[PDB]
């Protein structure tokens, strides 16, 4: 992922303000509520029967933080996303059988969560930069090599 010097500064400036405990759980929670079928992959997490159950689920919150941790690792190595995430892509594809389309969906949910939490500060320009970042992460986890 190439980001202009201005974008990298803007992106990292915002990420430095992110409360991973709140944003991570909200992003994973919204994924499961907005795209219901993703709940199948998280059966072991317990009760995911309703929006309230999902958002208040302890495992969902804790796991969302780990997801955000992976995004953090991505932002720190934008020039080596596929190398950084190859093990993760293997886990998600070969072991968990997660269809690639879902990676894009989580990226978009995260973008919506950033917008909800930062409001006006999440400008069209800030979004444009983050879209490049989430697209890079999703592409790295899908890992459609040749």
């Amino acid at each position: 992922v190439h980001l202009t010097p201005e974008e990298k500064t803007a992106v990292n400036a915002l990420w430095g303000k992110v409360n991973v405990d709140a944003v991570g759980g909200e992003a994973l929670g919204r994924l499961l509520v907005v795209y219901p079928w993703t709940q199948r992959f998280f059966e072991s997490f317990g009760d995911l029967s309703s929006p309230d159950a999902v958002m208040g689920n302890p495992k969902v919150k804790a796991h969302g933080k780990k997801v955000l941790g992976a995004f953090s690792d991505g932002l720190a190595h934008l020039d080596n996303l596929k190398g950084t995430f190859s093990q993760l892509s293997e886990l998600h594809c070969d072991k968990l059988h997660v269809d690639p389309e879902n990676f894009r969906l989580l990226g978009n949910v995260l973008v919506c969560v950033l917008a909800r939490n930062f409001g006006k500060e999440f400008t069209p320009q800030m979004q444009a930069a983050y879209q490049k970042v989430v697209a890079g992460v999703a592409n790295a986890l899908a890992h459609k090599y040749h």
Binding site: E26, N108, V111, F122, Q127, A128
Partner: protein, 141 residues
């Protein structure tokens, strides 16, 4: 297919948007043109270098169509037939672009309505926009 809860969530959320609908529609368009530059090829005659009056005026038309779709959520094919003629028959807009605009509208709503944009409302709005997109990209005459 929307559930009763989805329809209520969408009507309540769009009701809250109220007169800001046009502005949000214009912002969603600007976000789409900026984040996804390829979408600009559909508006060659538009002043897309910024949030022009053309983009604002167009955002208003889009918003009004959505307001109509929200009001007639159970009769969209008929209610939006003219828009299907335009998007599916004349312009032949690739469905991917509707996902892009829909995503940008959700981002806009989230940024402006933090408290109203709950996970449930977000979910219902996404399905609603997907259904609207299917109608506008389908040829059913």
């Amino acid at each position: 297919v929307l559930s009763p809860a989805d329809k209520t969530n969408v009507k309540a959320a769009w009701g809250k948007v109220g007169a800001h609908a046009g502005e949000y529609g214009a912002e969603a368009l600007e976000r789409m043109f900026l984040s996804f530059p390829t979408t600009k090829t559909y508006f060659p005659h538009f002043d897309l270098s910024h949030g022009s009056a053309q983009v604002k005026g167009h955002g208003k038309k889009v918003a009004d169509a959505l307001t109509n779709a929200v009001a007639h959520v159970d009769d969209m094919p008929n209610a939006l037939s003219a828009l299907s003629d335009l998007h599916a028959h004349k312009l032949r807009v690739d469905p991917v672009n509707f996902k892009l605009l829909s995503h940008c509208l959700l981002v806009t709503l989230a940024a402006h309505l933090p408290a109203e944009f709950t996970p449930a409302v977000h979910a219902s709005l996404d399905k609603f926009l997907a259904s609207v997109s299917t109608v506008l990209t389908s040829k059913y005459r």
